[PDB]
Design a protein around this ligand. Structure first.
Ligand SMILES: CCCCCCCCCCCCCCCCCC(=O)OC[C@H](COP(=O)([O-])OCC(O)COP(=O)([O-])OC[C@@H](COC(=O)CCCCCCCCCCCCCCCCC)OC(=O)CCCCCCCCCCCCCCCCC)OC(=O)CCCCCCCCCCCCCCCCC
Ligand SMILES: CCCCCCCC/C=C\CCCCCCCC(=O)OC[C@H](COP(=O)(O)OCCN)OC(=O)CCCCCCC/C=C\CCCCCCCC
Ligand code: HEM
Ligand code: HEM
Lengths: 24, 79, 49, 378, 106, 106, 62, 54
């Protein structure tokens, strides 16, 4: 019967549809 | 036993037709597609929407009311 | 009820190269069949690959 | 002479697909049923390359899928096609059914009744084998469904332990649920082969509701191409969903390996049952509650003989078209209720849908089809 | 029941005939009846100048819907010249079934 | 992480965290500035090390990310030009039947 | 009335039914030749300096 | 009427083994085809439990 803290969003470098992973 | 020989009986009628190779298959698609939709959407926009319209109200009412009594309980949690 | 009959006009559906009723179609016969078969000829290749 | 009409094998396929009189106005909606066939061959095929590898070991089961979705060539593709290609076989069903309650399609008593049976068999295979990825959602839904059938006054005690092989999930259960998946599937295919035998000998329908034996065109070159075109359009959406955003239709709680030491907090099945689970818990009285759960797939055989109109289909019935769109909105609010914790209005509101799914097609639809019979003098 | 207010009721009878759209496709009312086995025998009793008309109306008013237009507004079947050409051939097939039935019963 | 509010009791081994359902967890803070040394020549700030950790962890949880978004791209280009073909072959066939006139002569 | 490409194409290789079936075969040879590059170049240009082949030049052949 | 003849499904088993012409002097060497039919059918029900626990 309490609250919770939903995390925000960040422009992650791999968040796109046609993006990749920084391999460093 | 119901192939193309024996079915209903009809009489005194006639039909005409061309081939496909003597015609083009795009007779004013752009300038006749839109008016058909314009005339038909009006007729049944009124027959699918209003039944569906009374769910948005109840869903938003319940969502916002429950959000109140979950995020703002300490309002009536009087000391 | 017999002699009478005219096929109504199919003028607005024709190809522009056979829409004139003056000249024949034996000259206007290869372009049509070389056009309408390339869709399939593309299609077979597409299915293949 | 004509080999197409004298060979013992080709008479059967000429009379069945290539050369059968077909109407000519058919809506695309007559399209979808074939799609289901495409799904049927793909669920079977993709599903044997998992029983090849999987191990019915109660403390070996969960790590099995975990090594397949890592270890072998292209297994990450096949796992996800099998998990997603039935989120859509269940998409098809609700359209192929709802249409037959638009274009008067139940007057086919023989065709209609060999249907509902298939509905029941397909709906049960998915539950019967979504509990053997062997995770907490899988065990803790199995326990809950199991404890209901045990509330029969004299039935319950004995039947429940025969499926466990003991008292609770062990090596004796996972083995016979994995027994179940193999066989419901093959049996189902034969009921689909018989659905169509009925279909020959009445021919198809048309979206006006008037017999048209006058103008029937073949089912070669026309229905063959329209079908192929739409079919190679189902493979755009299926593959875009799977290979762009797979994790969208699932839950992140078949990842912690199964334990009796934890218990999930907000248990709820996937979307496409929460409808025949929202009636269940909507009401007290467990023995009764199980009965109201099956009142639904058998509500349907009771609806060829409540028909009370003079015409077929809703196309010419503009006042009944209102009541058919308060049925689907009912089934949408009733699925929004279920997958969500219990609060103040949820109980009061889910209740109305339960009361109404029945008041619409039990009282209303046979009594509002006369008010309009009286208006065109039949 | 009422007579003076029935002139109101006649009005709604014009409304429904405009709502359902079997006049828009060029049909009459009796063209749109569902043919169970009591209506499969009162069709085989028609004279052959009324049987053929019903065939031509249906075959024209069924190829409009695979083309998805409708017919010009001057061509709509007007409300009052509609014809009930099949009520009399049908309120006799029904009246003779009921009879074979009181026989068997009683 | 934040210090605990006023008037709230807590366990001796428990440390205050606002991101937890219980609002407290046994995680003794293991991450802060200059606990490590990045061999590549990077000024190691808490934010950067946490970011690198998260980018590592997701990849460990699902490595097929990079091999997925490439077939998901060589599917659209190939399909997106074959499918506009099938349509044309269709039109040919159905173009026999949309050109007929249908007259009646009793 | 100058003929288009279609008339000469149909005179060349389409009205044989023993030629037609072949050139369908042909496109895949051409497609196979011209498609790997067309997709790989665009994908690699979309995201550069970010995959191992763009970083291996630090450690490759000493 | 006659149910077997007119039903769309019974009509198929009636022409296959209830009512077809057969010769008078068929021996017992013509019994092996049906034995094979029986023989093939055991091997699938057995072979089921040999992979289920397998
Ligand atoms: C696989 C995954 C399954 C999911 C597939 C989705 C459904 C696909 C389908 O089968 O529909 C066939 C159907 C194909 O149309 P059709 O072959 O001409 O006739 C079939 C209709 O049942 C016959 O309908 P109709 O032609 O008589 O006209 C009905 C419709 C109008 O229907 C149309 O004319 C749709 C075609 C218009 C051209 C669209 C061009 C792009 C814009 O208007 C309405 O009543 C809808 C209410 C108002 C909405 C207005 C939007 C219209 C655009 O697709 C649609 O009707 C499109 C609209 C429905 C989408 C609803 C989704 C809402 C969210
Ligand atoms: C539930 C969970 C599953 C989610 C699936 C999502 C279902 C959404 C279906 C989308 C359809 C809504 C837009 C349709 C477009 C449209 O309205 O076209 C109008 C069009 C007009 O047709 P005409 O023949 O021209 O009639 C004369 C008109 N003057 O109307 C129609 O075709 C209606 C067709 C009915 C299809 C019904 C779709 C499913 C509804 C199911 C209702 C409840 C079923 C209950 C079964 C439960 C057990 C399985
Ligand atoms: C109507 C046909 C079928 C349906 C609807 C169906 C449904 C399902 C579903 C939903 C799962 C869950 C998988 C997951 O969540 O990861 C599953 C798993 C499984 N099914 Fe099927 N199934 C069908 C046919 C079959 C058949 C025919 C077989 C074998 C002959 C089979 C064998 C398996 C196995 C071994 C698993 C576990 C493998 C895994 O979880 O990765 N299924 N099934
Ligand atoms: C695995 C399940 C099913 C399969 C494969 C299946 C398949 C089919 C097919 C192929 C057709 C004929 C093609 C068409 O009409 O487009 C059809 C028609 C039909 N089916 Fe099913 N079906 C299934 C389940 C059901 C269910 C659950 C019902 C529920 C009543 C049902 C009722 C009907 C009806 C009434 C028709 C008649 C269509 C018409 O109006 O002509 N079927 N089905």
């Amino acid at each position: 019967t309490d609250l919770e803290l939903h995390a925000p969003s960040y422009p992650w470098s791999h968040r796109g549809l046609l993006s990749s992973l920084d391999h460093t | 036993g119901r192939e193309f020989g024996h079915l209903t009986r009809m009489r005194h009628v006639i039909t005409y037709s061309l081939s496909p190779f003597e015609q083009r298959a795009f007779p004013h698609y752009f300038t006749k597609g839109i008016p058909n939709v314009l005339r038909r959407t009006r007729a049944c926009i009124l027959r699918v929407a209003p039944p569906f319209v009374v769910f948005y109200l109840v869903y938003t009412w319940g969502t916002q009311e429950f959000e109140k009594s979950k995020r703002k309980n300490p309002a009536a949690y009087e000391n | 009820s017999h002699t009478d009959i005219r096929v109504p006009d199919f003028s607005d559906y024709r190809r522009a190269e056979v829409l004139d009723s003056t000249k024949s179609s034996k000259e206007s016969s290869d372009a049509r069949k070389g056009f309408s078969y390339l869709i399939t000829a593309t299609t077979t290749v597409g299915v293949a690959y | 002479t004509n080999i197409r009409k004298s060979h013992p094998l080709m008479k059967i396929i000429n009379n069945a697909f290539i050369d059968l009189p077909a109407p000519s106005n058919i809506s695309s909606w007559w399209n979808f049923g074939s799609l289901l066939g495409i799904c049927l061959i793909l669920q079977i095929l993709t599903g044997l390359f998992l029983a090849m590898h999987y191990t019915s070991d109660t403390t070996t089961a969960f790590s099995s899928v975990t090594h397949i979705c890592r270890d072998v060539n292209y297994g990450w593709v096949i796992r996800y096609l099998h998990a997603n290609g039935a989120s859509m076989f269940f998409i098809c069903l609700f359209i192929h059914v709802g249409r037959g309650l638009y274009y008067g399609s139940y007057m086919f008593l023989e065709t209609w009744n060999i249907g509902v049976v298939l509905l029941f068999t397909v709906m049960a295979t998915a539950f019967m084998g979504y509990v053997l990825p062997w995770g907490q959602m899988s065990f803790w839904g199995a326990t809950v469904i199991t404890n209901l059938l045990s509330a029969i006054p004299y039935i319950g005690t004995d039947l429940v332990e025969w499926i466990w092989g003991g008292f609770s999930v062990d090596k004796a259960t996972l083995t016979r649920f994995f027994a179940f998946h193999f066989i419901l599937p093959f049996i189902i295919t034969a009921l689909a082969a018989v659905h169509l035998l009925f279909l020959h000998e009445t021919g198809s329908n048309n979206p006006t509701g008037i017999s048209s034996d006058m103008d029937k065109i073949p089912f070669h070159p026309y229905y063959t191409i329209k079908d192929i075109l739409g079919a190679l359009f189902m493979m755009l959406i299926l593959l875009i969903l799977v290979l762009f955003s797979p994790d969208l239709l699932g839950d992140p709680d078949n990842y912690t390996p199964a334990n009796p030491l934890n218990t999930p907090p907000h248990i709820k099945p996937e979307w496409y049952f929460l409808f025949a689970y929202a009636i269940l818990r909507s009401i007290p009285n467990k023995l009764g509650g199980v009965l109201a759960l099956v009142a639904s797939i058998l509500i349907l055989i009771l609806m060829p003989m409540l028909h009370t109109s003079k015409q077929r289909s809703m196309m010419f019935r503009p006042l009944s078209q209102c009541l058919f769109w308060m049925l689907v909105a009912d089934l949408i609010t009733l699925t929004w209720i279920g997958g969500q914790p219990v609060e103040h209005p949820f109980i009061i509101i889910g209740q109305l849908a339960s009361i109404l799914y029945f008041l619409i097609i039990l009282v209303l639809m046979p009594i509002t089809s006369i008010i309009e019979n009286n208006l065109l003098k039949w | 029941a009422v007579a003076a207010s029935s002139k109101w009721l006649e009005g709604i009878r014009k409304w429904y005939y405009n709502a359902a759209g079997f006049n828009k496709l060029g049909l009459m009312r009796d063209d749109t009846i569902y043919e169970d086995d009591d209506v499969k025998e009162a069709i085989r009793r028609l004279p052959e100048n009324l049987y053929n008309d019903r065939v031509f109306r249906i075959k024209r008013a069924l190829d409009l819907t695979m083309r998805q237009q409708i017919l010009p507004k001057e061509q709509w079947t007007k409300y009052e010249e509609d014809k009930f050409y099949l009520e009399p051939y049908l309120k006799e097939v029904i009246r003779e079934r009921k009879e074979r039935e009181e026989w068997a019963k009683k | 992480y934040c210090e605990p509010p006023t008037g709230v009791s807590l366990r001796e081994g428990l440390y205050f965290n606002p991101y937890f359902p219980g609002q407290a967890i046994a995680m003794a803070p293991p991450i802060y500035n200059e606990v490590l040394e990045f061999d590549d020549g990077t000024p190691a700030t808490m934010s950067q090390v946490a970011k690198d950790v998260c980018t590592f962890l997701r990849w460990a949880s699902e490595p097929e990310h990079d091999h997925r978004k490439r077939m998901g791209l060589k599917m659209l280009m190939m399909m997106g030009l074959l499918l506009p073909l099938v349509y044309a072959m269709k039109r040919h066939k159905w173009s026999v039947l949309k050109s007929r006139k249908l007259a009646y002569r009793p | 009335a100058a003929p288009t490409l279609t008339a000469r194409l149909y005179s060349l290789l389409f009205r044989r039914t023993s030629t037609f079936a072949l050139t369908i075969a042909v496109g895949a040879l051409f497609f196979e030749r011209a498609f790997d590059q067309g997709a790989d170049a665009i994908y690699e240009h979309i995201n550069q300096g970010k995959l191992w082949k763009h970083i291996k030049h630090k450690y490759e052949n000493k």
